[PDB]
Amino acid sequence: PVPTGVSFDYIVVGGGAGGIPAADKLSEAGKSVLLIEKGFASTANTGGTLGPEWLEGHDLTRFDVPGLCNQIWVDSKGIACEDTDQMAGCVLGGGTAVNAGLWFKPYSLDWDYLFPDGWKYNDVQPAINRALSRIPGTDAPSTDGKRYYQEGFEVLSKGLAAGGWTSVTANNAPDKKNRTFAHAPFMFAGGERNGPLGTYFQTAKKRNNFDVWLNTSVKRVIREGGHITGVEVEPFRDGGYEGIVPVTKVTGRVILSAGTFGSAKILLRSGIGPEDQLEVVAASEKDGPTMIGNSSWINLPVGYNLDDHLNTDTVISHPDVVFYDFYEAWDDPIESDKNSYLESRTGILAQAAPNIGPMFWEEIVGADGIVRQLQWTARVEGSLGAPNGHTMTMSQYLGRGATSRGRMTITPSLTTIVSDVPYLKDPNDKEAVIQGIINLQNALQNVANLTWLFPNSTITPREYVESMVVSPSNRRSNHWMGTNKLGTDDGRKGGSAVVDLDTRVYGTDNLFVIDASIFPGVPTTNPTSYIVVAAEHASSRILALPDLEPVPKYGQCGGREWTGSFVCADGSTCEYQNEWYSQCL
Ligand SMILES: Cc1cc2nc3c(=O)[nH]c(=O)nc-3n(C[C@H](O)[C@H](O)[C@H](O)COP(=O)(O)OP(=O)(O)OC[C@H]3O[C@@H](n4cnc5c(N)ncnc54)[C@H](O)[C@@H]3O)c2cc1C
Ligand SMILES: *[C@@H]1O[C@H](CO)[C@@H](O[C@@H]2O[C@H](CO)[C@@H](O)[C@H](O)[C@H]2NC(C)=O)[C@H](O)[C@H]1NC(C)=O
Ligand SMILES: *[C@@H]1O[C@H](CO)[C@@H](O[C@@H]2O[C@H](CO)[C@@H](O)[C@H](O)[C@H]2NC(C)=O)[C@H](O)[C@H]1NC(C)=O
Ligand SMILES: *[C@@H]1O[C@H](CO)[C@@H](O)[C@H](O)[C@H]1NC(C)=O
């Protein structure tokens, strides 16, 4: 049901980590902004009604309560995305609606190392200060200020300190990421999930110039040559819109926030991507008939540069470790905790599941003289089939500096798949992983009664690693990034960049990408704060661009190398001549 009479200055596709802050910042500037979201209302502050029965009538949903964080693992359906082969949030708030909520003041090195000039640390520091003003951490999300079931934590944190590692409050010392441990920071506020759903979205829905369309999927963008006139929508659930939504004439811009796999899909379907992938959509049953003609295709490396943290699990067990079963907190919650979540917002349930114990980091100089960044996350839970009771799992992330990369491609079904596994292609990446375990072991060699299950004392760290299967299934961190890479090297000429420094899509005048897909690689940390920061930074850059000026007739409106305006002044049209030229006539 698309209304025959309306248009927007900005259309933002997808309501995730990138999209919600983008839509907020653009509407704050008084532009007409429409947020189009696949999924439904999630958290209570967005009008989400969904959740377990012990939550009735107290104005909370399954997405408000950090202790219910891990339900997505046993019950995801109608929530997780069905058009990808990996795990992603398809409700409002995207990933930030379903994840553990870990939230980090970024590490200045990450921006200096991963991004070209204009995105380095001195460039994005204002966006960092904005994002973290709206969402300061807490490493003690329970509103009374003290942390619960910390016995596991204290075992490890005293273990590490003894091993020569330094305690920090992570977000007070964002830049100290070598040989460091901290209480885990979260985006929570008032003991409720909070995040961008809690902050950016709330200021935006107070605005007249802001609109949200839920239960609505964007199929592709509607473009004449290099200029995007609108987006085409089919309902994902009844009550969603069918149609084609226009953007303000000439001026209008579209922002793709649909995610690392989401935005990539929309691009391919819009005739933007690699020749082979574009060819798959052309032969597709769903879009084949109505897809844009191949003369208007743009070749860019959409789907390449697929990146993720390489995850390696490890397990220990110790006597004073205390397990808590968060899965059992969905159905039959321990009643004092339920009582003491529902009234002052405290107790174990105001912490994310499972209990997420010490965060610790170190940086390893490799034989190639590349610095590789590690992050460990400890939790109280078994992992590798080790039992749940006294165990703690310590998961090692291989982050910034790792050189390997995979690929995302599309099926005839128009669902996305990871067809090149990104992990451990460079052996020096493996070397850092192994050395990190060795290092972890000697800091914990002095702890009384600590038992090493994974690896057990009968296997060497090296053997332990080489035996493992390298696949998303066992090794994914769910931190997928990079399919639409930001960079100065235009993809149409063979470069690696899908979008430019303004996040503008090469080959287009008005189309932009803000989400995890633009990152040249993964950062030190869980990315959500990074993606929010990037939303802050990109929206201000985009808002500093002057209004698009149309092309006078007889002028150039397009071509394979064209960087300029693709739209024609009133009284002439843009028509193709050859792949290097298009004129107004
Ligand atoms: C379960 C899990 C655990 C994780 N743990 C953490 C954590 O504790 N901390 C951390 O920093 N991050 C965590 N992450 C990483 C994180 O969730 C993502 O990195 C981040 O949310 C990605 O932001 P995004 O904007 O690129 O994607 P998304 O948040 O996934 O945004 C996608 C949004 O667009 C919508 N959408 C998709 N396609 C369309 C379409 N065609 N039309 C309209 N709308 C569409 C989706 O419904 C969704 O709302 C984890 C995520 C997973 C899933
Ligand atoms: C989007 O779809 C959802 C799910 O079907 C709709 O949410 C339901 O709304 C009814 C009444 O409006 C409630 O009784 C249900 O509890 C809701 N279900 C869920 C899962 O939230 C929602 O109304 C739809 N939104 C639009 C704009 O059409
Ligand atoms: C992180 O800190 C550790 C120790 O603080 C550094 O370890 C040193 O590594 C070099 C070789 O890379 C050795 O020659 C030194 O003797 C080590 N010192 C200690 C105390 O172990 C490590 O190099 C640091 N990493 C970075 C990237 O700064
Ligand atoms: C482009 O489209 C034309 C007509 O639809 C077709 O004949 C031609 O083979 C196509 N070329 C490619 C490379 O897809």
Numbering used by the authors: 223 to 807
Please quote the paper that reports this structure:
The DH domain oxidizes cellobiose at the C1 position to cellobiono-1,5-lactone with reduction of FAD. The ensuing step involves inter-domain electron transfer (IET) from the reduced FAD to CYT haem b, presumably by single electron-transfer (ET) events, followed by ET from CYT to external electron acceptors such as LPMOs.
The active site of CDH has two glucosyl-binding subsites for cellobiose binding, subsite B (for binding site) and C (for catalytic site).
